[PDB]
């Protein structure tokens with residue numbers, strides 16, 4: 167399971183955003199106490215120590231918690247950073263904390279996310295008015311024309327001019343097995359894939375009352391946009407940003423218009439591509455939900471209407 | 485399961501080698517009959533038709549056989565190319581064939597390979613003295629210093645100079661979970677990863693008597709080489725080439741010194757890296773075997789001796 171951890175640390179967008187987001191709240195943190203929810207190899211808890219926190223409680227449910235303690239002691243912080251195995255729901259802290267830091271976002275923000283555990287620790291261990299790092303998250307959606315997908319698909323109709331065998335029929339086949347499903351696809355896109363202006367359909371203040379509730383009811387909203395031009399619409403892409411309070415706030419973004427993160431994007435393919443043109447109106451509603459299977463697994467309910475085609479519904483799951 | 489098929493056709497090294505290997509045996513094929521063992525989307529069977537074969541029997545055990553028949557008819561060959569579902573072991577051909585063509589090589593040549601089915605069809609359906617495309621395969625091994633691996637590993641000792649947190653201890657951890665296992669790793673290397681001259685340890689004439697036997701006993705041999713210089717030896721890499729008879733023969737190679745194919749290479753990591761230097765002698769024996777679990781799954785038995793360190797044994801499986 168190392169691959170997941172090198173991928174995080176090699177994500178300098180993620181790592182620096184947190185380093186700086188923590189540093190810039192040095193005033194809120196200095197000589198105070200932090201709870202790091204899901205500390206992994208512990209780097210965040212050490213950032214907090216370096217921002218002058220008097221004491222940091224690094225709680226990590228997985229086996230990797232042993233590296234963190236090893237990472238803490240190697241960094242000379244066995245005295246102020248305390249690593250604690252076990253889920254945060256039942257860990258026992260000696261005191262309540264001034265701030266929670268956590269890297270809880272999963273793919274599509276909420277897949278296999280620790281947001282619930284963060285809120286739990288907020289209720290149970292965070293002092294009144296306490297700090298949350300990051301403090302909010304915004305969710306975005308844009309229609310896409312996946313350039314990688316168009317290449318994969320249209321390629322079978324290219325085989326003739328490369329080897330002299332017509333394999334055009336395989337494009338139907340490819341489409342059905344690449345788009346005619348309802349899984350959520352994690353793929354990194356670029357701006358060249360974006361087909362209308364990105365629309366922010368939800369905002370979560372982490373500290374706000376009722377958030378655990380909405381997480382269970384479904385997080386989302388409606389959206390409306392106009393295509394940039396003519397292409398096959400392949401579906402939609404969802405991503406997020408999280409914001410650290412400052413001064414001007416530090417934002418960590420996973421948009422395809424911004425530098426690539428390990429989160430990439432969550433793609434919602436239609437069952438087949440749709441020809442769109444300049445100023446084709448697309449609207450709909452998009453909802454992130456727990457799976458009845460397993461709330462750890464992200465469900466996304468999409469209702470969309472393309473131009474004046476009839477409105478459709480597609481129900482995705484990770 | 486489309487991904488496997490686009491990956492083959494987008495492998496122009498594989499596809500062109502076969503196209504040309506088939507074409508160059510036009511004299512052997514023209515107006516004669518071919519059996520294509522494991523025809524997939526059928527492109528090979530059409531190459532044969534284009535090389536003038538009077539009749540081609542495309543046998544494909546998976547569901548994809550329907551695309552092939554669709555591919556054949558779209559290419560106007562419903563009359564000479566016959567697609568037949570079901571394993572080749574029990575298909576019923578109207579006649580015996582003049583030639584077998586097959587893309588039977590799997591990762592490490594023999595993982596999930598159809599070599600046995602090819603030999604079966606050779607015995608049952610191939611006329612006396614009949615043609616085999618490809619006709620032989622050679623196996624190669626070279627010691628490697630995996631540059632990607634060295635980066636992954638040494639990176640934890642770099643974290644300090646990038647974020648100011650010492651994470652050197654995670655290098656031990658990474659090593660154990662990246663090398664302290666016995667799976668065969670499929671990875672594409674380059675020549676920059678090769679650490680001594682590649683050694684060919686086995687040759688299989690596909691047509692030769694006793695081959696099915698050796699496949700069950702184990703295919704391999706000893707090898708001896710001398711390192712190019714100072715680096716961490718991470719283990720070995722196995723690959724293959726197959727040869728089409730011609731004139732000078734056409735060779736399709738999966739060596740890291742040659743253009744990348746979808747087969748890449750099969751890597752055999754030691755439990756930890758070994759410092760080697762210029763002219764460090766490395767020898768050993770390497771054997772490809774069926775797994776007792778499942779002969780479809782490739783097993784590789786490595787015995788090696790590095791310099792004058794004691795000889796070691798490592799038993800890998802896909």
Ligand SMILES: Nc1ncnc2c1ncn2[C@@H]1O[C@H](CSCC[C@H](N)C(=O)O)[C@@H](O)[C@H]1O
Nearest residue numbers: 204205206207208226227228253254269283
């Ligand atoms: N309820 C919970 N209590 C404690 N840890 C949890 C948890 N749910 C998930 N986790 C852990 O939270 C971690 C998030 S990924 C680790 C990120 C960490 N900030 C780092 O830099 O390494 C995972 O290790 C996961 O095992």
Ligand SMILES: Nc1ncnc2c1ncn2[C@@H]1O[C@H](CSCC[C@H](N)C(=O)O)[C@@H](O)[C@H]1O
Nearest residue numbers: 522523524525526544545546571572587601
């Ligand atoms: N015993 C068997 N009989 C028939 N097909 C088999 C087989 N064992 C494996 N196969 C099939 O052989 C194919 C090899 S991959 C397909 C390669 C093919 N030449 C192409 O260009 O598409 C796979 O589809 C696999 O399903």
